[PDB]
Write a structure and sequence with these properties.
homotrimer; mainly beta; 5% helix; hydrolase (chains A, B, C); viral tail protein (chains A, B, C); EC 3.2.1.- (chains A, B, C); virion (chains A, B, C); viral attachment to host cell (chains A, B, C)
Amino acid sequence: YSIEADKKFKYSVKLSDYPTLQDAASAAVDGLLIDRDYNFYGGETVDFGGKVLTIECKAKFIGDGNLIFTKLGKGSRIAGVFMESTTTPWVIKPWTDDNQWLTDAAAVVATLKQSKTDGYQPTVSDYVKFPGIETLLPPNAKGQNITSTLEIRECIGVEVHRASGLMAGFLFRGCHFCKMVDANNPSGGKDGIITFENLSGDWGKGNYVIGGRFSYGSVSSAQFLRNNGGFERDGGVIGFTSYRAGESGVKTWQGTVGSTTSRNYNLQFRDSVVIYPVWDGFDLGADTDRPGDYPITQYPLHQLPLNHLIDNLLVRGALGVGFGMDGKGMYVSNITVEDCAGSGAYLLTHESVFTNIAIIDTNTKDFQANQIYISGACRVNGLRLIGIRSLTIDAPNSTVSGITGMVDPSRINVANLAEEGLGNIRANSFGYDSAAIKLRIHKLSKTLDSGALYSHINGGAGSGSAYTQLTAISGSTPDAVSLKVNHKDCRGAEIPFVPDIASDDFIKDSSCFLPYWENNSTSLKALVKKPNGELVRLTLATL
Amino acid sequence: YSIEADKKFKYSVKLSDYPTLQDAASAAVDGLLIDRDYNFYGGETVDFGGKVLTIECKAKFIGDGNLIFTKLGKGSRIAGVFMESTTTPWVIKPWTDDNQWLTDAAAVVATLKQSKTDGYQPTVSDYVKFPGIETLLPPNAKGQNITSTLEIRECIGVEVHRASGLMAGFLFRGCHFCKMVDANNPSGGKDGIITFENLSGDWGKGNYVIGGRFSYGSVSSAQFLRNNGGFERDGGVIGFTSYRAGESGVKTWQGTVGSTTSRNYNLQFRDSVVIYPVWDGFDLGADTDRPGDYPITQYPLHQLPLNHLIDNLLVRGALGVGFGMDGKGMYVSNITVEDCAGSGAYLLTHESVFTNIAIIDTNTKDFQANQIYISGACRVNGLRLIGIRSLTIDAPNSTVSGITGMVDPSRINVANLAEEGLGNIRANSFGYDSAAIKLRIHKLSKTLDSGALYSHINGGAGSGSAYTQLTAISGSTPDAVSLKVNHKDCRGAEIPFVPDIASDDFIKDSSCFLPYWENNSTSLKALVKKPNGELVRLTLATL
Amino acid sequence: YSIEADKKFKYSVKLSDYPTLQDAASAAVDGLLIDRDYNFYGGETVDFGGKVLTIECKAKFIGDGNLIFTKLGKGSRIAGVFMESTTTPWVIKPWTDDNQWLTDAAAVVATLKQSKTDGYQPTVSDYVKFPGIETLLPPNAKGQNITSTLEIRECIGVEVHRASGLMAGFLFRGCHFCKMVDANNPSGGKDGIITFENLSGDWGKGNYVIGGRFSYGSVSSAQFLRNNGGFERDGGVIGFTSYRAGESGVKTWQGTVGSTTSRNYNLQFRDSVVIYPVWDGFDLGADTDRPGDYPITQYPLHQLPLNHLIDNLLVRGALGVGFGMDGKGMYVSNITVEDCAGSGAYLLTHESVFTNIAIIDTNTKDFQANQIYISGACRVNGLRLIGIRSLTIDAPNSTVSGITGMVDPSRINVANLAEEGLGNIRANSFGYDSAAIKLRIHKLSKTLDSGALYSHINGGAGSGSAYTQLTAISGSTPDAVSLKVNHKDCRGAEIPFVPDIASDDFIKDSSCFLPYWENNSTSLKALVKKPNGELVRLTLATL
């Protein structure tokens, strides 16, 4: 029977039969079932002997610190893992029962409680976020470092599916072609919830966060260090949700970490949602002179050819910035940012194109100077501004087209704004006695319109009559001077004349006349510039 | 050997070894394989003893009524389940071989056949949808109630994957943190295909429909009762497809059910597609005085703070409304609705923002009064109307910006329409001898333009000449009065004058003159309002 | 014990216990584990006896040619399969280290190397793509046909999950309700990476490519032949990524293959990304007289009622066309195409609607005549053109609305362009001394504006003064003739007059006067058309 049984049954060992995880790992052939809670000590390392295993978790891994998995064969899968710390730390919860953010350090300190979730352990970044909190926090709430972390080290082709936990963290160190799939809402600890760190060895490649949701945590939900997906953009974050990150939803590290670069290139950031991060929705910058990376002489600060594939992202409720990045030669599309306390978008980009961007009700707490900032020479095609709620857009070197929304024109600063390809136009006016097409030369005034074409009702609704007027600003008084057609249904043109003797230089073109007033004779004269360019003054109207 | 075998093999029991499902459930330790069809009786209840099981289905559960699973441990997974009724009911199929909807009750009654799919059992809502069908339906086709339902009751953390069936239904009753994942196109029965009902106990939370597709069914594909995802929006529908729902694709219940509220809050509805529902694509309203919910004194009807996260939805072919909802303080974005028989969008919302909405060819059967209706004071930023096919938009209290499409201006009714931030403009005219920029004051007339700025060709194409004309409406005749520049390439301005003696009140501003006709002397006069405001009549031109 | 063991353990056989795959297949009951590499010969066929199996792959299937799986029961699942050829062919790599495409045949021939990835085997389509390469390629690099293909034949309800490989191919022949799910980046061979071919038997239905990523391959990544998803659109490509396809990312075949039609209907193509295809991003055309399909007399060429559901697609870096299709009565939405060498969109469609299309920096290598081409009578609602880089759009029979971007108006050709529903307008000018609203009648000139309304600064910034001018083109000189209001802050209107004796036909309307110059008396005259229509010439101004 043994011979037969050996050939007809699925192989799997279960933790309940062993004293240690390493013993179970050593006995494993195909499957490994975690069927009893396991308390691990920080730094406990398991060697899987290069075996391609299917680890099914139906119990918890309990401990503060890292449980290190090494030598898992390519194709190994871990499903249902649940990390939980032994320590219950002091956490702050910077939001109210009405989901309003608390910005006052004293109000935030008052939220302190011991819990493994529904808040996060304060870190030094909170000292910046809630000014003065550093001196108000009790010593037992400062410098905590609790995280129950599953560390997969130097493995290739290992996937973690439906992971969860309390004060949990997942770290892929020196890995490639690894994925964090369908995370079942782990509640984060002190460190990043899902981190792909490749500071040693080759640049990380093929590392992804696919689907799932992540909550809380003291720092960023998902983070990458020294990863390069190559031209194929093999790596990144797709289809994920981040809720209430202590720092940002997604963060590609910037600057030097250790003696090398922590920057990232060629990754995808698509079809994702980030809600209520304490800092930013997406922090995709690379610069904060670049050991291990491109020299500043080759690519200036904030001008690295990051080449990320960025599309279809939604950010809502950030206490910081909705979407931030730097880099040169980027193409970004379909970004929607709503209800953010700081800038909806903070772009330190150059020679980049932004298509179909919607920044709705951001910088609601005046944390920044504008709702959207772009430093370099970029192109914006389709920009929706203003929802239902300091410049709105400050992109001094950018050319923009297609802004929609109830924007205050005086709060727009761009290099060039144009609608070169509209067809025949109709201006439809609702709730007013007139329709208008205004012109504003920002060089002259950002607050006053320099001229206009209006249509005003004569009499009342249903009169079937209106008058058209062409205006010009004078003495900083909009519409000071105007020509009217059909005022009071008179069917004639009312023409403005120079109130005094017209100077020779008032007339511009040949074969034109400019009427002027000669008060001493109660006459209307006309300065005429003959077709030959010569000036002559004629009498136009008299008593 | 037994000792060894017990430690090296994967545990799983299979239904073929037991007489009843409960017996198999009682023997189960890790896996449970459904390897033989099982006929269950309505109300048959299985107690899983709190075990965390992996139930793999490779056969059907056959029966009319509910098969109730209870006490499944957190982390349990059911995959491949297939529900099928024992009864083959009478179903109607309200569409033709060309996929045209049938709206005539007699034509619909004629489609009657006995089948477990490709149609649905008529319900009372059909009496409303196809007027008169109630009296035409034969008695054996009325009041049917066939559904083979898998009911998961009061469980936490249970997921159902790749479910399918015929006349199938899936009901999570009193559950939390449960998911219906990658449904493999079950064909629905009388009840909802996937329902999360939490009328008793705590409000449902963490309940999701993730991916998959659902077809037919007499009522809504996915439905939620008394679920609240909290600030974290933990719950909802993401990435799913609904085809031909007897009622709606997605429905959040409204009103009182029993002695409590069936309403829902804080859920996500994203990246989903609903095609051909008999009623609506998405029915996300909460109100139809609110036992178990907010009092009408706190939040008026249709003004509950639902706070759903709604983004990236596509609806096509609804016989009813594409997208419907109510509520206050909502942010909705990226909705595309095409080819609907009733309104594309029916919004009973207040103080809400709608960004990038596309309503293309809706209300094609004039079921409603408009293509898009918004009752309250909302903001619309980016609205695309008209495809290739009664007001188009009726949002009396809303402010709109960014409408694109061949809309008939007379079919627009909003509180305010404006393009405050366009740049320098160019109106490009194709196929006509002129380009135009028209002005229409809706208060004066919704059908006639009150004035215009035109450019007309002089001679023919390639003449290199055109004349510009500024017009005004008079006597309800558009462009009745006008000033022209360069008519017939004359290089002069043609000026209109009052056809008779100008009355003193015809002139508006100081330092302006208004020419008028004095027929009895064949003279042109000029009513002049001197710079000092005084009126004087001068002779302008004579024989 | 045997009795007990037989009832409590999971059944699974493993390849390591058998000499051939068929032997393992015959012994299988529930699971089948591929735990050792298996070298198969081309055409090796395995009969699974109608069993519903779960095949778990933890090793490779090695061989050139097809490994044919037949008679798998409905519900069977294959996970982790890895196909690899025995031959290492000669492949070309038409791109540089900077990711620039190589278009020169000699430069491409120089990339030749023997490898199972990072390039592809040249085919006859390359002879067209890189002109002259046919004669430059060494004979050992021509006509190669290496592909290690898993062929699933005539099965229903079989899913392949997380497949991978080198020179790999996956072919579903005569299958229905089959899915290729979460492909783990297989590197393609000579044939399509995932193909659903239904040339024999019923039209394919329920066949999908869900998620995953595919790379390289000589032809298209995903391809369909004779599939019809029905009204329910049961089939297609959703959520996938294609990188560097030798031909196109997605291809629905066109024309006759064998003695039947290879065309496809009613499929979904959504939420997908295609990057760097050598040919096109999406090739969704059906026509290239139609055996096995609609006769040309019923539906003319390129006018088949394909009815695909197309939404949310992104294409970047195509050496060919970004998005291409034909058909009549289509609704297409939310397409974003960036940085393509050939046309961003090539549409041989009629009576179709395109909503929210963004074509950014395409036809960068002038491969085609335009960035977007539409042949038939279509409607475009929302079109974003120009990023940071020959007509731009040539849609002679289409009506368009909502173009945004820095488009050159002279490069637009459409049947009608209009913005019928804008509200009150403001033209904001940045960086210039004037704001402008120009009018261009394309029938008159596609390069010159026929008239304009300008506002120009008087003096300098902060002067609080500007003049408004209405212009008209004459003698092909834009703004040749104009009326000004407030030039040099004079507060009067400068009026142009006919430089010579005005001919009777110069005046257009009654009750209007046209000033003209009478040089011989240094007088300004006025041709007057009295309110009764009669002409009279009066003296207007004199010395």
